[PDB]
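@here heads up, posting the sequence + SMILES for the adenosine-5'-triphosphate run so it's all in one place. Ping me if the SMILES looks off, I pulled it from an old spreadsheet.
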Amino acid sequence: VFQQYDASSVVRRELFRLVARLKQIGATTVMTTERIEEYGPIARYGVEEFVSDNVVILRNVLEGERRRRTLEIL
Amino acid sequence: EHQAIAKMRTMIEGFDDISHGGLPIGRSTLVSGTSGTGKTLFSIQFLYNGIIEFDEPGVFVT
Amino acid sequence: EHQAIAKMRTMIEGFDDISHGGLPIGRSTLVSGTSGTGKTLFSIQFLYNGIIEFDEPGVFVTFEETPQDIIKNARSFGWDLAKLVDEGKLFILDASPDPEGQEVVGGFDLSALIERINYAIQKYRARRVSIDSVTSVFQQYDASSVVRRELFRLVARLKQIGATTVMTTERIEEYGPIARYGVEEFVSDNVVILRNVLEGERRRRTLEILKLRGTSHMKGEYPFTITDHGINIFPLGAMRLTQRSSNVRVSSGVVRLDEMCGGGFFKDSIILATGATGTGKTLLVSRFVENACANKERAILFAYEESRAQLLRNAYSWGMDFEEMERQNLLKIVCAYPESAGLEDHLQIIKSEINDFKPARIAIDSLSALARGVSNNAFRQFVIGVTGYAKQEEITGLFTNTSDQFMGAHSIADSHISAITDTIILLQYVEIRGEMSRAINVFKMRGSWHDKAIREFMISDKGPDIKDSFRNFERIISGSPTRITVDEKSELSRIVRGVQEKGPES
Amino acid sequence: EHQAIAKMRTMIEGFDDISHGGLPIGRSTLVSGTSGTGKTLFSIQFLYNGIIEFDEPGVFVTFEETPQDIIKNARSFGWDLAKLVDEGKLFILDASPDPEGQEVVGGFDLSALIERINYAIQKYRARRVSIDSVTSVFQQYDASSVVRRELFRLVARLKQIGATTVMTTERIEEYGPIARYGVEEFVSDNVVILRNVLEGERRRRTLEILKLRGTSHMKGEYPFTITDHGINIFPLGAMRLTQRSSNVRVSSGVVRLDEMCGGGFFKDSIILATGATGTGKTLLVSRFVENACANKERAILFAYEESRAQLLRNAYSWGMDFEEMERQNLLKIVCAYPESAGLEDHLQIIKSEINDFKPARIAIDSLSALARGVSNNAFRQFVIGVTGYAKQEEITGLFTNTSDQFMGAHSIADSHISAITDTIILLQYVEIRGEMSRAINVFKMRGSWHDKAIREFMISDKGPDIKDSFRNFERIISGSPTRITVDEKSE
Ligand SMILES: Nc1ncnc2c1ncn2[C@@H]1O[C@H](COP(=O)(O)OP(=O)(O)OP(=O)(O)O)[C@@H](O)[C@H]1O
Ligand SMILES: Nc1ncnc2c1ncn2[C@@H]1O[C@H](COP(=O)(O)OP(=O)(O)OP(=O)(O)O)[C@@H](O)[C@H]1O
Ligand SMILES: Nc1ncnc2c1ncn2[C@@H]1O[C@H](COP(=O)(O)OP(=O)(O)OP(=O)(O)O)[C@@H](O)[C@H]1O
Ligand SMILES: Nc1ncnc2c1ncn2[C@@H]1O[C@H](COP(=O)(O)OP(=O)(O)OP(=O)(O)O)[C@@H](O)[C@H]1O
Ligand SMILES: Nc1ncnc2c1ncn2[C@@H]1O[C@H](COP(=O)(O)OP(=O)(O)OP(=O)(O)O)[C@@H](O)[C@H]1O
Ligand SMILES: [Mg+2]
Ligand SMILES: [Mg+2]
Ligand SMILES: [Mg+2]
Ligand SMILES: [Mg+2]
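bot reply: prediction finished. Complex structure tokens:
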């Protein structure tokens, strides 16, 4: 959604907004973000981690031509 | 309430042990990962089991 | 105290030691860390403790988290911040944005905040202030130079107002810049860095005070865990060397052995048991613990290799009923895979269980089980921990270790947990006439004389029977000795012919 | 269509194994890689195979290379696209820029192209489409967010159109992001990464299917080669542990050995001969390969340590005439230094040459010669590939391994062949009275009973002459015996 022409700070707020309004609605939501480095930033803009109350990281680490899927609750 | 945070079971095999109960009720959970990691699936399955295990309707925004 | 700056205590277990007394009053501390490291908690605990322990009202400035949430989450550790906000001891100043807002407002609000805060401090007569996620505010659209100015101004007014402040900050790398804008580091009087290092799929949180303008403090990183009671720090390097030392002996659960040690182990002493897999360290452990219960003394048994069932199936087969030791509330067995956590966690669990049961004897079956994976230093740090806490707790202890190679092991411990140990019990397999016999040896004892022979020992249903030494043998330790004989048939009871009786009579 | 995802086979050697059936139909599959990875080739061979196998027309859209060249290059793999273009089976839709023009024509053309494209799809009744270097299009002056919308629009239209597309992208780092904008990743239903890794001055191209939305596939990287017949992928993990096993026996070339092996070598089995340098391995291989020509059966000899001519001399110097074997088209010698290829290429050459000569036996001289330089794991992965193919192909194979240390060697294979090999023949130097004498031993045989004695053997112009056991010695295996010369019972 923000991948139209935004920057971290603008992203951080938009997310804060969505997260908040959902809290008021009383919904137990699961949001999906994307990454680019298996061990780089937790999310695309380096700001989502700090705005979410909860964070799950799914990894697909390489290493020796094999792939190992893991899951972590940050 | 006036107690800790209550959780909601995901029924995803294992995840509810890892999360000591499941996802925190009334709140969102960010799930990220590179391409091909299981994000969408995690979300589909979370709604699903909610449906098929507690009859908790789910909305899927895509 | 010979420090030049006055400090205030966090009452956070372990922090006040690391900072040689707590946080400097009237000054500000940057607690910066990546995501989920314990920043809010630290700052929340910082105000709570100040209210619960010293009746010091506190102000909590929150930029992202909602006041209801700060209160909802704190119940995780059993804290009723609501009752305090109510008694008017705690005041949460909500400065979070609106779920339906605009854009632009991070400077005059920095002047409106200062004034808001001053108002709250004056109204509630506050002595401690926490500012959670200052970073999030410039996270509207700012650069390093603007941040430095606004942070300074804020911090500088706080100093004037007299307030002792804690400010939270974020960072993306565990080892790179201290805070986001690489400017916060230098504006703060003190800097505490919280990390959550990944490393081999495990997570290790540490706490480090980087700087304290005015006094000294412990340098480097310190392991810690967040539990139901908040942060819990282990200053493993602040552990002094002043353990009491008695000449009190105790039994090992094995009569012959006690003789071999010149009269049993010392109460105040770390015991080391090493031998090849199958030699029988675990038997002496069972025997060691049972004797603490045979004298009506408590004793814990942390198992990291055998299930709670097996430990009992095997224990019983050696006699000794563990079922009863448990009922008489005298013997407590733990059990856990070293993999089920990190040393820090493990060391604490141990510490905990030692308090909730006031043991007089502890046994860790297989240090080398905990040795799995962990680097050697991270392991030694643990061994210093368990061996240390016990020594100063007068708690006698038996530690087990499995040497990676049966027969031929050139060293006691592949880890060198040698100098850390007072008494060493060495078991090994001796190859005599196509068979694997056992051989036990009291390698070393610091205050005692102890027997110098490498005896042979059998394992029956009864337990460990310590026979004699293979005198007429060389290269013993090798694993496969050479039988040389200046005798053997020499006396002892020659008298040939009919010497025995058989099942009927004698 | 209320069923699982259905796949369309590419027919690209190995790819359909990995993707469990092939590319999903009606969906776009991103295939990115760094410069020179075989992206272009993949898409081509994808349409071509489509045509030449299921008569499914193909629409190839290029943005940089030119139609003349595309066809020009394809001839490198022995196929004429021109012909297919003629018969309207393939329509190369040129979309490259000319040496002259204007600018500020951003998303302006992505709309038109989606038209020119749907046209050629309808018009030719195309079922497969390949778009080469979509990337090179936005490489005009765009941002990550602009590229996602232009990409999504295209991918989307194509899915309505119902085509099974393949889009080529480019990367800059072998292991960094997936595509230039680190956005393509998330816009494609499927992502296949082509890599051209450069470790130790050597190059190794691998292919990986990062994801296939809606189905399963093989995970991780998979070695592949680019030959005259196109991309060739070896799914060394796909190979199954379902090899035929008989009780039929064969001769080792050495009568006395055959007895020690309790009746000979099993037709179905892997033979490993290990010993210090000079012990006689190359001899056994020599004798083994000869016995298969005495029975008029074909046998290949892949030598990696000696040359053609020298293999003959020494062979002839032990008897056996290799000169005849070659003429009688019953024996074939290959030879090549391990340094002349990667294991991926060798493993192929081996397989390739076995198909053009249908061997009943095979001898690789010096497994350890192929272990030279290559990592321990990248080697084992070569052993299984060679050991397996021969095993499921009913071929009897002999592999030679020089042990890094003469006398003292505390392990058969330094690299660890154990349990990958059926029969282990072990040669060792033995020092008896200031003299270097040999000794052969049948270490293990999974089927038969074989001899348990360590036998001394000599070498002459007649070949291996297995003598007796050092019965009266100790620490033979060690290599520096000690005769017991026991004074009997001393009366
Ligand atoms: N039936 C299945 N059996 C085994 N693996 C499957 C099956 N279905 C899907 N997969 C695997 O799961 C992956 C699907 O990922 P998914 O669509 O859940 O979300 P994602 O990769 O996190 O995000 P994105 O929407 O970018 O793909 C595939 O890449 C594939 O490897
Ligand atoms: N009762 C508890 N027992 C054990 N761990 C707990 C408990 N409550 C919270 N935690 C842990 O402490 C963490 C809470 O972090 P905290 O709220 O203190 O601030 P933070 O992680 O520093 O910053 P942020 O606001 O970005 O999350 C959780 O990630 C969780 O693992
Ligand atoms: N009932 C029994 N009767 C005779 N011998 C026994 C009996 N139980 C155990 N043993 C002997 O004791 C050994 C068991 O080893 P033990 O449990 O004492 O610990 P360990 O050898 O130090 O360490 P680990 O069990 O992890 O290898 C067996 O190898 C066996 O020879
Ligand atoms: N007959 C052939 N035998 C062996 N290798 C070949 C043959 N033809 C081409 N190649 C190899 O295949 C490669 C061709 O690459 P190709 O044109 O398919 O696209 P690409 O490398 O993916 O992308 P780009 O447009 O950047 O070149 C060459 O780099 C070359 O090494
Ligand atoms: N005509 C011959 N007469 C007697 N002995 C010979 C003759 N030719 C070769 N030999 C012996 O055989 C050995 C040659 O080794 P061979 O060709 O069998 O392979 P290898 O020892 O297994 O491996 P590599 O030669 O690569 O080290 C010589 O060391 C020598 O003792
Ligand atoms: Mg997804
Ligand atoms: Mg044991
Ligand atoms: Mg190309
Ligand atoms: Mg050779």
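MO: Residues B 33, 35-41; D 186, 211-213, 215-217 surround adenosine-5'-triphosphate (ligand 1) (CB under 6 Å).
MO: One more: The longest helix of chain C spans residues 144-161.
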